[PDB]
Structures are given as C-alpha cells and as structure tokens.
Amino acid sequence: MLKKKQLTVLDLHPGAGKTRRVLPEIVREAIKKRLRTVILAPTRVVAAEMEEALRGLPVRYMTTAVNVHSGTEIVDLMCHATFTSRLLQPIRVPNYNLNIMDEAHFTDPSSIAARGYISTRVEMGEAAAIFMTATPPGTRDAFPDSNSPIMDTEVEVPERAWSSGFDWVTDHSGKTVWFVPSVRNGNEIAACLTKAGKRVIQLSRKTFETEFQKTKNQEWDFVITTDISEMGANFKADRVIDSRRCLKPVILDGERVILAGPMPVTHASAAQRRGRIGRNPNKPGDEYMYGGGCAETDEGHAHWLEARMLLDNIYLQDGLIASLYRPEADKVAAIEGEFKLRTEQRKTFVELMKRGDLPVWLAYQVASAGITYTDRRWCFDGTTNNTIMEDSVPAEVWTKYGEKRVLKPRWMDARVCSDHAALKSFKEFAAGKR
Incomplete structure (x- = not known):
C-alpha cells in the first residue's frame, strides 16, 4: 500500500x-x-x-x-x-x-x-x-457485509410526531439510532419520543463533538442524529431506524443557496447508517429499518462546489490547480481555478469561514466582493426576498452602530438560518459580535 x-x-x-x-x-x-x-x-x-x-x-x-x-x-x-x-x-x-x-x-x-x-x-x-472507508465514492451497495447478520426491513418511518400506527418504534426494548434529515425534523421526533417516555439524545454537526459523550455517560433509548453520525460515530445499539432522507444544499442561479428536499440519501450514506449495527459478531439479529430508497443526490450538491472553492485557493505548484478526486469530480460543474482569490481576499475568505463560521459558498461571495471581514453592511442590504424570518416575522438585530435593523443578507444561504442555533450565530455575526 x-x-x-x-x-x-x-x-x-x-x-x-x-x-x-x-x-x-x-x-x-x-x-x-x-x-x-x-x-x-x-x-x-x-x-x-x-x-x-x-x-x-x-x-x-x-x-x-x-x-x-x-x-x-x-x-x-x-x-x-x-x-x-x-x-x-x-x-x-x-x-x-x-x-x-x-x-x-x-x-x-x-x-x-x-x-x-x-x-x-x-x-x-x-x-x-x-x-x-467502507463506502468509496461510487458505491451503489446500501447493504454491505457486517460482522453479524442484520435484519433489513423496508417500512414507513415517521418524519413528524405520531400517535398510532408506528407501535414497532416504541415497543422496542433495546437501543435505537435514528437518522433524520435535519436538526428541526430531529427535534420534532425527539419531542414525540420523550413524551412517550423515551430517553432521547440528539446529535448534529454543531453539537456532535460535545453531546456524543452523553451516549457513553447516560442511559438512553434513542439517539436522534443527522448524517454527522455517518462518519465514524459508534454506538452500543441493536437497531437503526433510517428515514433514508437528507437535505441537499443547492446553489440556485449562482445567486443563493437553498436546502432542497428532504430527498433520498446516497447508497454510501445508507450503508454508513445501517453500518452502525451488526458490528458485534456475538450479537446477531440487530435490526435496520429503512423508510425510502437511495439515489445519487450528491450530484449538484453544493458541498462539491464549495470544495472547488477551497481547492482553488490552495497552492500546489506554479499556476496549477488540484482536481477533485476523480470518482467525485463529476458531482459539480465548475471551471477549475474560477474561485482563486488574491492574497488578501483569500485571507478574508478564510476568516469568514473560521472565525465567522459562515458556509463556504457564503464566505466566498463576501470575500470575492472585496468586503473586509469585519464589515457587516452586506447583512442588511439584500433584496426584500432575502429577509430572514424568526418566529414568522422578520428577524432583527442591533447593528454594531446601535441601530435595530432587519436581517437581510445580500447573499442568502439557507444554512445560516436552518435551525435556531444557526440563526442565533448568524444574528451575532450580523451584529458584529465575532
């Protein structure tokens, strides 16, 4: 090797x-x-x-x-x-x-x-x-080998609170890992399980590095997780419930990012999700319940465009621009080098992503427009249809100048307000607080 x-x-x-x-x-x-x-x-x-x-x-x-x-x-x-x-x-x-x-x-x-x-x-x-990885870019095997056999069952998986008709979810006496399309969707299912007397732990990207310890240190019946748990996370579970759904960030008209879906997950993602169970060769009969089919929904996914934005700004050798890994290079339509920024703009781009905690696409829009990192005027001067709503009314922050204004970013990226924690962090950014 x-x-x-x-x-x-x-x-x-x-x-x-x-x-x-x-x-x-x-x-x-x-x-x-x-x-x-x-x-x-x-x-x-x-x-x-x-x-x-x-x-x-x-x-x-x-x-x-x-x-x-x-x-x-x-x-x-x-x-x-x-x-x-x-x-x-x-x-x-x-x-x-x-x-x-x-x-x-x-x-x-x-x-x-x-x-x-x-x-x-x-x-x-x-x-x-x-x-x-068990699932190289390109797999179409959602049911790979396991250390012990898995009971695979296609079954309608609830995606909202439910009363009746899903007794198999709560009659289970072991431990379940449940992959949901989004944090918000995970919240609603968590609340439903908790009201039914289950002990729920919730995992997502922003919380993973912290809450994961709770799966070792606390009693739990369900872990409700986004796809972050596809990447190495392991659990002493005997069932996985897989909505087989995800959200897909999509760049519309090169001008905005929306969260399309929920839509089918890839085969790789489905295999990684199922792969959390059937891992103990001394405990056959773990269960995998899946609520939909797979599809190649990474094609067009903004993450590969954003990956080009990063790689366009990494030096390799005179002029040269690194290609994406060949088996995933087709997942994005982009001109190699089209996102390369000069020395100072690349710096702003990086600070927007690191300290600013902005999505790559959004960081790039701000930095390639020549906006310096601390200049937050762009958060307020977008078109009216870029207004960010909080609790069904336009969201508002006090600017660093002390003026209360409506959150209205010049470039709209749905990932900055997709759940409450995301909106809170973007409001502080627009306020000049980091």
Whole structure:
C-alpha cells in the first residue's frame, strides 16, 4: 500500500478492522520506512479513538482532542478540516509522503477538498495515499457485509410526531439510532419520543463533538442524529431506524443557496447508517429499518462546489490547480481555478469561514466582493426576498452602530438560518459580535 505514486482505496466492510487493526499496521510500517505521514480523522471524537488504537506509537496529535508528546514524531494526526484549513493559510504544511484519510467518504467540503489535494499530489508522483472507508465514492451497495447478520426491513418511518400506527418504534426494548434529515425534523421526533417516555439524545454537526459523550455517560433509548453520525460515530445499539432522507444544499442561479428536499440519501450514506449495527459478531439479529430508497443526490450538491472553492485557493505548484478526486469530480460543474482569490481576499475568505463560521459558498461571495471581514453592511442590504424570518416575522438585530435593523443578507444561504442555533450565530455575526 505504501509504495510512492500510489493511492489505495481501503474498502473493508463496516466493522472489519480498518481503524483498530489496519491503521496501526500501516503506521508501524510507515515509521519503519521513515515515511513522513499524516493521519486524517473526520472529527475530534475519532481522533481520540485513534489515539487509543495507536497507543504507544510515536504520533504527534495536532488536536486538542487528545491528552498526550516527545517532539520527535514523524507521524502527524489531525482532523480533515484542520488539514485543509492549514493548506489555505500561510502556515506551512509538510509535503507528506504518506496520506492516510480515515472515513474518506466524509462529504464535508474541506474533506472533499483534502481528497482532491491529496490525489493530485499522488497523480504528480509526489506522495502515496490511503483512503479508508467502507463506502468509496461510487458505491451503489446500501447493504454491505457486517460482522453479524442484520435484519433489513423496508417500512414507513415517521418524519413528524405520531400517535398510532408506528407501535414497532416504541415497543422496542433495546437501543435505537435514528437518522433524520435535519436538526428541526430531529427535534420534532425527539419531542414525540420523550413524551412517550423515551430517553432521547440528539446529535448534529454543531453539537456532535460535545453531546456524543452523553451516549457513553447516560442511559438512553434513542439517539436522534443527522448524517454527522455517518462518519465514524459508534454506538452500543441493536437497531437503526433510517428515514433514508437528507437535505441537499443547492446553489440556485449562482445567486443563493437553498436546502432542497428532504430527498433520498446516497447508497454510501445508507450503508454508513445501517453500518452502525451488526458490528458485534456475538450479537446477531440487530435490526435496520429503512423508510425510502437511495439515489445519487450528491450530484449538484453544493458541498462539491464549495470544495472547488477551497481547492482553488490552495497552492500546489506554479499556476496549477488540484482536481477533485476523480470518482467525485463529476458531482459539480465548475471551471477549475474560477474561485482563486488574491492574497488578501483569500485571507478574508478564510476568516469568514473560521472565525465567522459562515458556509463556504457564503464566505466566498463576501470575500470575492472585496468586503473586509469585519464589515457587516452586506447583512442588511439584500433584496426584500432575502429577509430572514424568526418566529414568522422578520428577524432583527442591533447593528454594531446601535441601530435595530432587519436581517437581510445580500447573499442568502439557507444554512445560516436552518435551525435556531444557526440563526442565533448568524444574528451575532450580523451584529458584529465575532
């Protein structure tokens, strides 16, 4: 796997050993060959798990998620987004001879970016790489192998509060992980289960790194999660309920981002969701209930456009622009290099994404217009149909000038107000509070 000019797709089925068994073997061999190696974890939660599986091995953990260091480590471990972020900023990133990406199906924009950067360096003959995932880009197998057999059942899955007609959901006495299309949809199902006496934990991107510990430290009957739990999260569960639905961010007319759907999930996503159970070879008969079919709904998905925006602003070599990883490059229509920004605008672009916590597309619109990071006038001077509503009336903030104005961004991205926490953070941004 480790010879240069080589990208390997490690596609063992879920539970097959990739992180606890294969990754330490690869790391020990890379240390022997003095290969300067990066290990890319999708989340800080998986980083901490990797430290457990890599225990003792000389690895520099470039994350505050891991409580360990000598300084004489030639293997680095950092998060997907940390790797891409460091490539975008002045900070120098080593020319790694070996690039290991765990959970390499992760569809976050900075993970697609990182896959494109890494496969380009391999195609240039400069590095080797190993992508680890049960579900490579392109799978159409939503029912891969498991450590023990799974009962698969197609069945109507409620997506709103229900009274009767779904007794199988609440009659269950084990532990269920339930994948929902959105945080808001998860809230409504959570409330319904809680009112039926169930102990519910809710997981989403903004909360995952914090609430996941509750699945270890508390009693629970249901985990209600968005697709963030497709990327390494593991549970001592015996049932998965899969609405088989997701929201799809879509750029309309190059001018706005909407959250289309809910619509079918990909096969990869369905397999990753089912893959949370049937993992214990000593406990056959875990259940997978799925409430819809799969489709290739990553085509047109804004995350691949945003991935091009990131990769267009990472230096490779004179002029050159890294392609996306070939099997996912078709998921977006874009002119390579069309998003490259000059030195100062790239800086604003990065600060908008990092400190500003804005979606990539929105950060790009603001930065390529020449707006400096702290200048929030664009949040108020959009067209009337860009008004953001809070509780059925136009949302309002006090500007940094002390003036109460309606939230009306010049570029509208539905992800900044898709749930309450998202709207709260965007209101503080528009107020100049970060």
